[PDB]
Amino acid sequence: PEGLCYGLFGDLAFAAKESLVAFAGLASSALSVFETEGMRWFVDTAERYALAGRPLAELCDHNAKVARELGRNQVAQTWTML
Amino acid sequence: DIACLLPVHKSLGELYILNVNDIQETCQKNAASALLVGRKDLVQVWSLATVATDLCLGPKSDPDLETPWARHPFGRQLLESLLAHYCRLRDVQTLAMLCSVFEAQSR
Amino acid sequence: MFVARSIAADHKDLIHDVSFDFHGRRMATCSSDQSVKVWDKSESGDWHCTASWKTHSGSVWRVTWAHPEFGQVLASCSFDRTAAVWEEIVQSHWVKRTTLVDSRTSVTDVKFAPKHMGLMLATCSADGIVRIYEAPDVMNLSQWSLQHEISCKLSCSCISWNPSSSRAHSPMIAVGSDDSSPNAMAKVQIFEYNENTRKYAKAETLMTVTDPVHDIAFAPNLGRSFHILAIATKDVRIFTLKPVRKELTSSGGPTKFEIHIVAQFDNHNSQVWRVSWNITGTVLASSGDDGCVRLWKANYMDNWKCTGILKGN
């Protein structure tokens, strides 16, 4: 009586029988989508990282600064230690 | 005088400092003094300790929020490797300094 | 916390299956009114139906998307003992491309294969037979060939491919049953493909599962070195499969595995109907008969704990 699925953006699609949520009231279903106010850090990191064209120290410093901007402290520390 | 044979130096003993309140300042000054004496591995180790003991890597009370930095391979495992190497070298000075600095973060 | 939004589906009967596309922008819903509908969202975020055509003669159980590299392709399994493969052609017209009718009983489920394996399809029927179809020419969807068929001795209810893209893992498919015979027999069997023999052979069997199974799902691998499986029953179970090092004898048989159960939850207090993973294979969503959805995640110590409860309306 139920269908459930996930989405790429953290959305959750859920369709359930009307009886389980609230001639015959068992012949209908309700469809809902749940949304997050989900993985934007992935896109932001992928868009502004530097990978070539500069010496190793500059790349490490730039990546560490970018990581610290988004609040991922451990990644920045890893870049600095590298 | 055979000070050129032992794995410890008197000048470094005179130049090292240990302030509980500030860790970064102590690490930077120790690195500078080690550079002055002529040890390079000490400079590298002190710089690594400078980075690895920053305040922003403080552990959380709830285990379910994030992986503690001690679990990260650049934490406990790196410290163990350094301790093993210097135990093989029998450098008591560096061992004491590291075991003091890293422990002090626990408070 | 999540925010809910209701959608007016206007389906004349129960909605059986809902599935997103590859890019997470289009949705497909199949219902018992012999109907399939496609929904697209706009800049405003509202969802609009863009197609509604009758497909089969009986109820429609499952509908799934194909990888966009092959085009906008849908596959649906029906109660009329058929499977159908549809395509979109340019307005937007959905055209039946192929019909598979080799089954003599109700087709319980259908699913596509991972992209790196090509264009392959797997259908499991109620008589206990799983068939694998392949299209040698990706530019001609009207022709398909039957590659392998497997008999499971028990009625099938759900299948799942292993989404691992590594070259160290042979393709794997897991099949579940929903039989209710009093005999306490196995319900989950895992087959593996052998390159040397060019045949799927039984590899593993979960003896600890005896209740009827309603759904199973592999988790996306995305770099791990072992496999995670999720099973829905009277409770929710999670298993881990670690392959063992291959012996130097180079045996041609199926790979051996070490099986462990890492989580068993019964917070729904009812029959758990559906399970699903997220994109990265880190959060598990379970929907049961209580009318609520639950989310599960594991901390760094490998302890799975509930993280969210969602209620309809």
A1 in Cβ contact with A20 (< 8 Å) = yes
> Considering only CB atoms, which chain B residues are within 8 Å of A69?
none
Backbone dihedral region for residue C302 (phi beyond 0: left; psi -120 to 50: alpha; all else: beta): left
C67 in Cβ contact with C115 (< 8 Å) = yes
The boundaries of the domain holding residue C298 are 1-243+258-313
From the CA of A49, how many Å to the nearest CA of chain B? 21
Q: What angle do CA C85, C86, C87 make, to 5 degrees?
A: 135
Rounded to the nearest 5 percent, the helix, strand and coil shares of chain A are: 45, 20, 35
Residue B2, burial from CB neighbour count under 10 angstroms (0-12, 13-18, 19+) = exposed
Mutate to test the interface with A, among C1, C6, C20 (most CBs of A within 10 A): C20
Chain C residues whose C-beta sits inside 8 Å of any chain A C-beta: 1-7, 9, 11, 13-20, 23-24, 27, 29, 31, 47, 273-280, 285, 287, 289-291, 293, 310, 312-313
Q: Mention every residue, 6+ apart, whose C-beta is less than 8 A from residue C105.
A: C81, C125, C126, C127
Domain for residue C15, yes or no? Answer: yes
Q: For residue C67, give both structure tokens.
A: 């990888």
Rg (CA), chain B: 15
Dihedral sign (CA C120, C28, C154, C57): negative
Q: Would you tell me how many other CB atoms lie within 10 Å of the CB of residue C236? A: 22
Candidates C282, C276, C280; CA nearest to C300 is C282
Domain for residue C253, yes or no? Answer: no
Domain for residue C252, yes or no? Answer: no
Q: For residue B100, give both structure tokens.
A: 């003091």
Backbone dihedral region for residue C115 (phi beyond 0: left; psi -120 to 50: alpha; all else: beta): alpha
Cα separations in angstroms, B51 against A63, C131, C167: 16, 58, 38
Q: What is the Cα–Cα distance from A13 to C278, expressed in whole angstroms?
A: 12
Residue C232, burial from CB neighbour count under 10 angstroms (0-12, 13-18, 19+) = buried
Candidates C152, C208, C212, C153; CA nearest to C179 is C212
CB contact (8 A) between residue C312 and residue A14: yes
Dihedral sign (CA C220, C223, C227, C233): negative
Domain for residue C120, yes or no? Answer: yes
Counting the structural domains of chain C, the total is 1
Q: Name the experimental technique.
A: cryo-EM
Candidates C174, C259, C269, C153; CA nearest to C216 is C174
Q: For residue C9, give both structure tokens.
A: 């589906």
CB contact (8 A) between residue C305 and residue B71: no
Residue B52, classed as helix, strand or coil, is helix
Residue B61 DSSP class:
S
Candidates C200, C198, C102; CA nearest to C159 is C200
Residue C258, classed as helix, strand or coil, is strand
Domain for residue C249, yes or no? Answer: no
C202 in Cβ contact with C194 (< 8 Å) = no
Domain for residue C36, yes or no? Answer: yes
> Considering only CB atoms, which chain A residues are within 8 Å of C273?
1-2, 4
Q: Count, in order, helices (H) and strands (E) of chain C.
A: 0, 25
Model resolution, angstroms: 3.7
Domain for residue C199, yes or no? Answer: yes
Q: What is the Cα–Cα distance from B106 to B58, expressed in whole angstroms?
A: 9
Q: What is the Cα–Cα distance from C152 to C124, expressed in whole angstroms?
A: 10
Domain for residue C8, yes or no? Answer: yes
Buried-state track C186-216, b at ≥16 Cβ within 10 A, e below 16: ebbbbbbbbeeeeebeebbebeebeebbbbb
Q: What is chain C's length?
A: 313
